[PDB]
Amino acid sequence: MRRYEVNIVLNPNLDQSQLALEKEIIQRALENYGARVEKVEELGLRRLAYPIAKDPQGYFLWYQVEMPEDRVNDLARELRIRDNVRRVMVVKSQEPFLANA
Amino acid sequence: PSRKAKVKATLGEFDLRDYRNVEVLKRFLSETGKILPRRRTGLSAKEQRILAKTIKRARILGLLPFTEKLVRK
Amino acid sequence: PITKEEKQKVIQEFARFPGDTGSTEVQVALLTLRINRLSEHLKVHKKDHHSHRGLLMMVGQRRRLLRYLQREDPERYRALIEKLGIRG
Amino acid sequence: KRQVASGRAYIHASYNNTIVTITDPDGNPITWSSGGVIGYKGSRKGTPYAAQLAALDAAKKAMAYGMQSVDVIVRGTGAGREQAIRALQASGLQVKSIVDDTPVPHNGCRPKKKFRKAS
RNA sequence: GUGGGAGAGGGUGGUGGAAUUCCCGGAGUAGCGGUGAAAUGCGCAGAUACCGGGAGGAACGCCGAUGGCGAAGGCAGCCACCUGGUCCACCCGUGACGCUGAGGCGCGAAAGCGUGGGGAGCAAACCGGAUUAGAUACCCGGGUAGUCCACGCCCUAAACGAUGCGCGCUAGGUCUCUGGGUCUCCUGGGGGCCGAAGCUAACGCGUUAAGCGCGCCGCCUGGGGAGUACGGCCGCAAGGC
Ligand SMILES: NC[C@@H]1O[C@H](O[C@H]2[C@@H](O)[C@H](O[C@@H]3[C@@H](O)[C@H](N)C[C@H](N)[C@H]3O[C@H]3O[C@H](CO)[C@@H](O)[C@H](O)[C@H]3N)O[C@@H]2CO)[C@H](N)[C@@H](O)[C@@H]1O
Ligand SMILES: NC[C@@H]1O[C@H](O[C@H]2[C@@H](O)[C@H](O[C@@H]3[C@@H](O)[C@H](N)C[C@H](N)[C@H]3O[C@H]3O[C@H](CO)[C@@H](O)[C@H](O)[C@H]3N)O[C@@H]2CO)[C@H](N)[C@@H](O)[C@@H]1O
Ligand SMILES: [K+]
Ligand SMILES: [K+]
Ligand SMILES: [K+]
Ligand SMILES: [K+]
Ligand SMILES: [K+]
Ligand SMILES: [K+]
Ligand SMILES: [Mg+2]
Ligand SMILES: [Mg+2]
Ligand SMILES: [Mg+2]
Ligand SMILES: [Mg+2]
Ligand SMILES: [Mg+2]
Ligand SMILES: [Mg+2]
Ligand SMILES: [Mg+2]
Ligand SMILES: [Mg+2]
Ligand SMILES: [Mg+2]
Ligand SMILES: [Mg+2]
Ligand SMILES: [Mg+2]
Ligand SMILES: [Mg+2]
Ligand SMILES: [Mg+2]
Ligand SMILES: [Mg+2]
Ligand SMILES: [Mg+2]
Numbered sequence: 160m161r162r163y164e165v166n167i168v169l170n171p172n173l174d175q176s177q178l179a180l181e182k183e184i185i186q187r188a189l190e191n192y193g194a195r196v197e198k199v200e201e202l203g204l205r206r207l208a209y210p211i212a213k214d215p216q217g218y219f220l221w222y223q224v225e226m227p228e229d230r231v232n233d234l235a236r237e238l239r240i241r242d243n244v245r246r247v248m249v250v251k252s253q254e255p256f257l258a259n260a
Numbered sequence: 261p262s263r264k265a266k267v268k269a270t271l272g273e274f275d276l277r278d279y280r281n282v283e284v285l286k287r288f289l290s291e292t293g294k295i296l297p298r299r300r301t302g303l304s305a306k307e308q309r310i311l312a313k314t315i316k317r318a319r320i321l322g323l324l325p326f327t328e329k330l331v332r333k
Numbered sequence: 334p335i336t337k338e339e340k341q342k343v344i345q346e347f348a349r350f351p352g353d354t355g356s357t358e359v360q361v362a363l364l365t366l367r368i369n370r371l372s373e374h375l376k377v378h379k380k381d382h383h384s385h386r387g388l389l390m391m392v393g394q395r396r397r398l399l400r401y402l403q404r405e406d407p408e409r410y411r412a413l414i415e416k417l418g419i420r421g
Numbered sequence: 422k423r424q425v426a427s428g429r430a431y432i433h434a435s436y437n438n439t440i441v442t443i444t445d446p447d448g449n450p451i452t453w454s455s456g457g458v459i460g461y462k463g464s465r466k467g468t469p470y471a472a473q474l475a476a477l478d479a480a481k482k483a484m485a486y487g488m489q490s491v492d493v494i495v496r497g498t499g500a501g502r503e504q505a506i507r508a509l510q511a512s513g514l515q516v517k518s519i520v521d522d523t524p525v526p527h528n529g530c531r532p533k534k535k536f537r538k539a540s
Numbered sequence: 541g542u543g544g545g546a547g548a549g550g551g552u553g554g555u556g557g558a559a560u561u562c563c564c565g566g567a568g569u570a571g572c573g574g575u576g577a578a579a580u581g582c583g584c585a586g587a588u589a590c591c592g593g594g595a596g597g598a599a600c601g602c603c604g605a606u607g608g609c610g611a612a613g614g615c616a617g618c619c620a621c622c623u624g625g626u627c628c629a630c631c632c633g634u635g636a637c638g639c640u641g642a643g644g645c646g647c648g649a650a651a652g653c654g655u656g657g658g659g660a661g662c663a664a665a666c667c668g669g670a671u672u673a674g675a676u677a678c679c680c681g682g683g684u685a686g687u688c689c690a691c692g693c694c695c696u697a698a699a700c701g702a703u704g705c706g707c708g709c710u711a712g713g714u715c716u717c718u719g720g721g722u723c724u725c726c727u728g729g730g731g732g733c734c735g736a737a738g739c740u741a742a743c744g745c746g747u748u749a750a751g752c753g754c755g756c757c758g759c760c761u762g763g764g765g766a767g768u769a770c771g772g773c774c775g776c777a778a779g780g781c
């Protein structure tokens with residue numbers, strides 16, 4: 160059981176319905192792999208530095224979770240299935256390292 | 261010798277390991293998309309070494325450029 | 334990996350008395366744990382040699398400690414072997 | 422016959438030859454020139470002067486499409502790069518900007534023996 | 541043992557962007573390329589230069605260093621899992637359990653071999669163009685094995701610090717990586733430079749010893765013949781000891 164962070168970037172052109180369905184699938188899969196959600200941040204659409212999937216912007220989701228390590232990789236797979244989901248990056252959480260303090 | 265400005269001293273309290281904060285990291289990138297050297301960033305070995313991996317992370321997420329085109333010249 | 338709870342389990346298990354972390358029995362026990370875990374790791378990933386070196390070093394240390402026990406107190410030696418199930 | 426009137430100027434320069442391509446803002450080309458278009462044949466194409474002639478010929482060809490302002494794009498490290506720049510600078514064409522786009526790999530491909538002792 | 545740290549140490553899966561080549565579409569015209577100068581070559585079946593989309597293979601730009609890790613070979617995009625080594629603080633535990641190490645066993649760059657796959661760029665052999673007295677070369681245009689993956693062999697090297705491993709002792713100055721502390725500084729581990737005593741044929745070495753000592757292993761005994769011949773062992777062969 161380790162504490163991770165799930166970054167998900169998906170299609171900015173989605174209407175509220177399709178988007179809701181996507182987040183629904185995310186939550187669903189998360190429950191399937193048994194990841195407790197500690198907190199969440201929805202950053203919305205933002206300007207990318209380079210075009211992703213031909214589209215200049217992207218919609219961001221961030222989930223701080225706790226899940227069994229052994230399935231983490233196996234989880235990412237699922238999240239990458241959706242065509243609407245163009246990026247998935249999972250990171251082991253880390254205590255912030257401050258500079259100029 | 262880079263006597264113009266040191267990026268660290270030009271900034272306040274901030275987290276180096278945080279990959280989601282662009283408005284800071286962007287200051288650590290050159291005119292081109294390249295990661296600035298120790299002379300310019302004014303960091304230390306440890307700091308710079310962490311900032312490197314975080315910047316790369318930000319690049320993969322699409323927040324930071326891999327490369328840019330040089331203006332003027 | 335090897336979590337603290339497991340380690341305290343085997344330590345408290347083999348300890349000659351309460352509060353003993355350093356006995357030959359304890360050491361041989363810990364080493365046997367690590368060795369078994371590593372071998373199970375090298376059934377898969379058999380192309381990873383750098384770790385196999387570590388396995389050789391651990392095996393060596395265990396054999397030396399066990400040798401020491403065998404010299405000092407053959408009873409405790411046979412006991413340790415029996416509870417651990419080493420030597421094949 | 423288009424009448425674009427605003428466009429892009431691509432300078433491709435190497436130690437061997439300099440070649441200029443003028444395009445619309447979509448990137449599609451209109452006209453082009455090079456040291457070969459002018460009477461120069463051999464090594465003389467890698468000249469600053471060859472470059473000047475090239476950029477000027479491309480400019481003149483592109484005036485006939487009635488163009489005025491261009492963005493210059495520089496690629497390659499070669500002789501007659503800055504000279505082709507200066508040529509376009511006042512050809513009568515207004516130079517809106519200059520940008521070096523020269524492709525640098527992240528080290529994908531092994532170079533020819535000529536370019537090696539690097540990666 | 542407890543608590544902390546740094547790291548391109550290793551293995552498996554996934555993944556990102558730049559570039560090269562090929563393909564498709566748009567636009568566009570007479571050359572591109574390459575050299576000391578050229579030609580072969582490619583181009584009117586529309587090349588080069590430019591924009592858009594797609595496929596595939598290989599390597600990871602800046603960070604990056606006089607840096608870090610590893611026993612050595614060696615290791616560099618990013619993420620996750622599995623996993624080795626190691627350092628510091630606390631003085632907690634066992635109680636000489638140590639050091640070296642013939643033989644053995646394992647690892648071992650590149651090239652090379654077997655089977656299957658892959659093949660973008662580069663490129664032995666080879667096909668050509670130049671140069672030259674000749675040019676079985678240097679330079680130029682092509683190009684097969686190979687370079688890439690998996691599994692199995694091969695065991696070589698300027699496999700280098702041309703310096704076996706471990707422990708103790710013998711001025712300091714300075715730079716640096718990485719811990720801890722009363723954080724001007726002290727203390728510990730690693731990487732560099734100049735230098736005390738001392739050593740060395742000299743160059744140089746000098747708390748990272750090539751100094752002062754002890755233990756154990758390996759090796760040398762004038763040059764060519766020759767790492768050859770024979771024998772044995774190993775190898776599918778090349779060939780190795
Ligand atoms: N190992 C790969 C690297 O691990 C890094 O993290 C590594 C280190 O930072 C971390 O250090 C650990 C930690 O518990 C703490 N600092 C002390 C501890 N002794 C260390 O554990 C160490 O020893 C054990 C055997 O006892 C090994 O199994 C382990 O690999 C080694 N790191 O253990 C991690 C695994 O070795 C980063 N994830 C990244 O650089 C990379 O993935
Ligand atoms: N690809 C990631 C790496 O794969 C390694 O091994 C992998 C690759 O070496 C091997 O080949 C893969 C495969 O998908 C298929 N044959 C083609 C594919 N392009 C390759 O993957 C890789 O190829 C090369 C490195 O060889 C990289 O340059 C490239 O980015 C990457 N796609 O396939 C293996 C897995 O199927 C190791 N697991 C580790 O280094 C790392 O995870
Ligand atoms: K011709
Ligand atoms: K080094
Ligand atoms: K400190
Ligand atoms: K002397
Ligand atoms: K010297
Ligand atoms: K040998
Ligand atoms: Mg997808
Ligand atoms: Mg030892
Ligand atoms: Mg030329
Ligand atoms: Mg590593
Ligand atoms: Mg075409
Ligand atoms: Mg050609
Ligand atoms: Mg051809
Ligand atoms: Mg022809
Ligand atoms: Mg025709
Ligand atoms: Mg082309
Ligand atoms: Mg393209
Ligand atoms: Mg292909
Ligand atoms: Mg470098
Ligand atoms: Mg070293
Ligand atoms: Mg005590």
Ligand SMILES: [Mg+2]
Pocket residue numbers: none
């Ligand atoms: Mg006692």
Ligand SMILES: [Mg+2]
Pocket residue numbers: none
């Ligand atoms: Mg030994």
Ligand SMILES: [Mg+2]
Pocket residue numbers: none
């Ligand atoms: Mg031996």
Ligand SMILES: [Mg+2]
Pocket residue numbers: 648
């Ligand atoms: Mg080998």
Ligand SMILES: [Mg+2]
Pocket residue numbers: none
């Ligand atoms: Mg090989």
Ligand SMILES: [Mg+2]
Pocket residue numbers: none
């Ligand atoms: Mg083969």
Ligand SMILES: [Mg+2]
Pocket residue numbers: none
């Ligand atoms: Mg084959």
Ligand SMILES: [Mg+2]
Pocket residue numbers: none
């Ligand atoms: Mg070629």
Ligand SMILES: [Mg+2]
Pocket residue numbers: none
């Ligand atoms: Mg060739």
Ligand SMILES: [Mg+2]
Pocket residue numbers: none
């Ligand atoms: Mg020839």
Ligand SMILES: [Mg+2]
Pocket residue numbers: 672
């Ligand atoms: Mg001659």
Ligand SMILES: [Mg+2]
Pocket residue numbers: none
């Ligand atoms: Mg063959």
Ligand SMILES: [Mg+2]
Pocket residue numbers: 695
């Ligand atoms: Mg051998």
Ligand SMILES: [Mg+2]
Pocket residue numbers: 700
């Ligand atoms: Mg050397």
Ligand SMILES: [Mg+2]
Pocket residue numbers: 701
């Ligand atoms: Mg030295």
Ligand SMILES: [Mg+2]
Pocket residue numbers: none
């Ligand atoms: Mg060394």
